[PDB]
């Protein structure tokens, strides 16, 4: 399988910046969502879920085809709750119907991060919508009641090493779990929607307690009212993971750089970029545009 990146016919940077601006502006305006968390987190999660279905073995899945748009994918239990981000993007797509889905879902995650004050993530256009049959089967996304071994092994399928895994996980500082979606609940609330290295600090700083929740699942709850998934917690049980966690807890800049690189990578997995392809774009935030 070869997925070659094909620039939307006749569009340039400026055309892309506009879609970005539209998402951003809508993010600003719809701030009531999930009790004032906003849609940032869910968009980030959505961009990670359309991309984490990738299989470096056979090159199937990944962000390329925008297959989330189909029933199979769309109704994937691990995707429970992502429909809200989809609905959020829907009108934007309507406004800019020439953008591919894969491009849209992915751009939302980028805009979200940048608008939530995270680092700039270079982004590449060119994803192409594939047919319904290219939709990966369910079961490709990671479970949360596991440990480091599982995690390590899991991410390998996506070509991510240890530093990449830890950098990517710091996105867990955003939003929250919802009992109805995944069977986990918390923070005890409420929540975060600024991008920072907070995830690491919490993990190292709190006094976590293992407890079962209303869905009959275990989770690590802290006195401060926070929570961590077992898989989250696992980054401190593993010696290799732990030193990286510590590193990020100490240097937000380090964390931002690595996150940036890993995120782009995650979103570009499985795609082939012709030589003639335009470089990746770095979009300006609203604020940088004075909007």
Name residues contacting ligand HEM, limited to 63-102 (CB under 6 A).
81
Query: Among 249, 245, 224, which residue's Cα sits nearest to residue 236?
Result: 245
Task: Compute the least distance from the CB of residue 5 to ligand HEM, in Å.
Answer: 22
Q: How many CB atoms lie within 10 A of CB 27?
A: 22
Give the single-character DSSP code of 227: E
What distance in Å separates the CA atoms of residue 107 and residue 199, rounded to the nearest whole number? 24
Residue of 104, 166, 169, 227 interacting with ligand HEM (CB under 6 A): 169
Residue 163, interface with ligand HEM (CB under 6 A)? no
Residue in the block written with tokens 């004032």: 36
Query: Please, how many CA atoms are within 13 Å of residue 286, restricted to the half-sphere of its CB?
Result: 18
Residue closest to ligand HEM, measured at CB: 175
Say how far apart CA 279 and CA 79 lie, in whole Å: 31
Neighbours of 240 (CB within 10 A): 14
CA 137 to CA 65: how far, in whole Å?
Answer: 14
Stretches 55-63, 123-131, 171-179, 267-275: which one binds ligand HEM (CB under 6 A)?
A: 171-179
- 41 near ligand HEM (CB under 6 A): yes
Least distance to ligand HEM from the beta carbon of 10, Å? 32
Closer residue to ligand HEM (CB): 135 or 177 = 177
Contact 144, 182 (CB under 8 A): yes
- In whole angstroms, give the CA distance from residue 116 to residue 101: 22
What is the pattern of x (binds ligand HEM, CB under 6 A) and - over residues 95-134? ----------------------------------------
Between 101 and 192, name the residue whose CB sits nearer to ligand HEM.
192
Q: Does 39 bind ligand HEM (CB under 6 A)?
A: no
54 binds ligand HEM (CB under 6 A): no
Structure tokens at 64: 């390329």
User: Is residue 139 classed exposed, middle or buried when 0-12, 13-18 and 19+ CB atoms within 10 A define those classes?
Assistant: exposed
Binding segment for ligand HEM (CB under 6 A), chosen from 99-107, 174-182, 243-251, 279-287, is 174-182
State which of residues 59, 181, 272, 285 lies at the interface with ligand HEM (CB under 6 A): 181
176 binds ligand HEM (CB under 6 A): yes
142 touches ligand HEM by CB under 6 A: yes
Give dist(CA 165, CA 178) in Å, integer: 23
Q: Is 168 in the site for ligand HEM (CB under 6 A)?
A: yes
Total residues interacting with ligand HEM, rule: CB under 6 A: 23
- Give residue 55's region: left, alpha or beta (phi > 0; psi -120 to 50): beta
Shortest distance, position 165 Cβ to ligand HEM, whole Å: 8
Span 223-282, contacts to ligand HEM by CB under 6 A: 229, 231
Contact stretch for ligand HEM (CB under 6 A) within 11-19, 92-100, 120-128, 169-177: 169-177
| Residues 159, 180: Cα–Cα separation, whole Å | 31
Q: Which residues sit at the interface with ligand HEM, rule CB under 6 A?
A: 41-42, 44-45, 48, 81, 142, 144, 151, 168-169, 171-172, 174-178, 181-182, 184, 229, 231
């Amino acid at each position: 399988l070869v997925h070659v990146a094909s620039v939307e016919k006749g569009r340039s940077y400026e055309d892309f910046q506009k879609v970005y601006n539209a998402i951003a502006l809508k993010l600003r305006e719809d701030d009531e969502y999930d009790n004032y968390i906003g849609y940032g987190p869910v968009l980030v999660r959505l961009a990670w879920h359309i991309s984490g279905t990738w299989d470096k073995h056979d090159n199937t899945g990944g962000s390329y085809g925008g297959t989330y748009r189909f029933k199979k994918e769309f109704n994937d239990p691990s995707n429970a709750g992502l429909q809200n981000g989809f609905k959020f993007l829907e009108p934007i797509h309507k406004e800019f119907p020439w953008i591919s889905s894969g491009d849209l879902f992915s751009l939302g995650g980028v805009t979200a991060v940048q608008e939530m004050q995270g680092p700039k993530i270079p982004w590449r256009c060119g994803r192409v919508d594939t047919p319904e049959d290219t939709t990966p089967d369910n079961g490709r996304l990671p479970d949360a009641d596991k440990d480091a071994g599982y995690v390590r092994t899991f991410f390998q399928r996506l070509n991510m090493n240890d530093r990449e895994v830890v950098a990517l996980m710091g996105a867990h500082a955003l939003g929250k779990t919802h009992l109805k979606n995944s069977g986990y609940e918390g923070p005890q609330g409420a929540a975060n929607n600024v991008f920072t290295n907070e995830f690491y600090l919490n993990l190292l700083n709190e006094d976590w307690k293992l407890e079962k929740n209303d869905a009959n699942n275990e989770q690590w709850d802290s006195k401060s009212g926070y929570m961590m998934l077992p898989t989250d917690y696992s980054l401190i049980q593993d010696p290799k993971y732990l030193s990286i966690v510590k590193e990020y807890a100490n240097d937000q800049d380090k964390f931002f750089k690595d996150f940036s690189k890993a995120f782009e990578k995650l979103l570009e997995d499985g795609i082939t970029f012709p030589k003639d392809a335009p470089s990746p774009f770095i979009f300006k935030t609203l604020e940088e545009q004075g909007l």
